[PDB]
Design a protein around this ligand. Structure first.
Ligand SMILES: NC(=[NH2+])N1CCCCC1
Ligand SMILES: [Ca+2]
Length: 223
């Protein structure tokens, strides 16, 4: 997260870290057995880390649970990142508490101008590299589809939206992928892609979760 702030420990209790020997992506807990992330975060051997603040220190509220299965969206296109969403099932259910909590799925799509909370352990610099140990947060509005498509001609589908600031300085970044965009208490986005980080006229691009609720619910009910 570039241009954000330190969330505070466990203040984003649905935020998970995906670990394969190291943190490599975020995700969101949607019930005690299932996490939503980005398809471009797919790999085998994922351990889901819940209750994290400092990802380099055991602080006492963590749960580390291996994934038993991962399901990439059937229509995911790795060239274009269309349908950049996957589901991860936990081998054992998480123990839900104030610091390990699920986030609700949308009942409809959110409007442009709605303010959202984006979070992750990704790079905090727009030129160069610095990774935080603790979770970072950014408040950012959903941008109009026209400003999104103007920034990325030919690349935006109906399964994507932009959020952030056209003036630059505030954005998600490498290592935030797969993590949440929450608006009005609902998981509306997944950190997906962008051009650089926090650059002018290049807002972040997010998977549009409201298009996937039926797929999510049916997939988890059958797996
Ligand atoms: N929002 C961005 N600029 N991103 C998304 C996360 C990966 C790097 C590009
Ligand atoms: Ca920790």
């Amino acid at each position: 997260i570039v241009g954000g702030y330190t969330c505070g420990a466990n203040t984003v209790p649905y935020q998970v870290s995906l670990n394969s020997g190291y943190h490599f992506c975020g995700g969101s807990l949607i019930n005690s057995q299932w996490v939503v992330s980005a398809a471009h975060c797919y790999k085998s051997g994922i351990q889901v880390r819940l209750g994290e603040d400092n990802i380099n220190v055991v602080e006492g509220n963590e749960q580390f649970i291996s994934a038993s299965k991962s399901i990439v969206h059937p229509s995911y296109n790795s060239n274009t990142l269309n349908n950049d969403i996957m589901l991860i099932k936990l081998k054992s259910a998480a123990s839900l508490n104030s610091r390990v909590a699920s986030i609700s799925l949308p009942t409809s799509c959110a409007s442009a101008g709605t303010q959202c909370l984006i979070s992750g352990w990704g790079n905090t610099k727009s030129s160069g590299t610095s990774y935080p140990d603790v979770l970072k947060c950014l408040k950012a509005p959903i941008l109009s589809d026209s400003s999104c498509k103007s920034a990325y001609p030919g690349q935006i589908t109906s399964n994507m939206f932009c959020a952030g600031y056209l003036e630059g300085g505030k954005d998600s970044c490498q290592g935030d992928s797969g993590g949440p965009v929450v608006c009005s208490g609902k998981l509306q986005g997944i950190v997906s892609w962008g051009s650089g980080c926090a650059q002018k006229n290049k807002p972040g691009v997010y998977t549009k979760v409201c298009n996937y609720v039926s797929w999510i619910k049916q997939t988890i009910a059958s797996n």
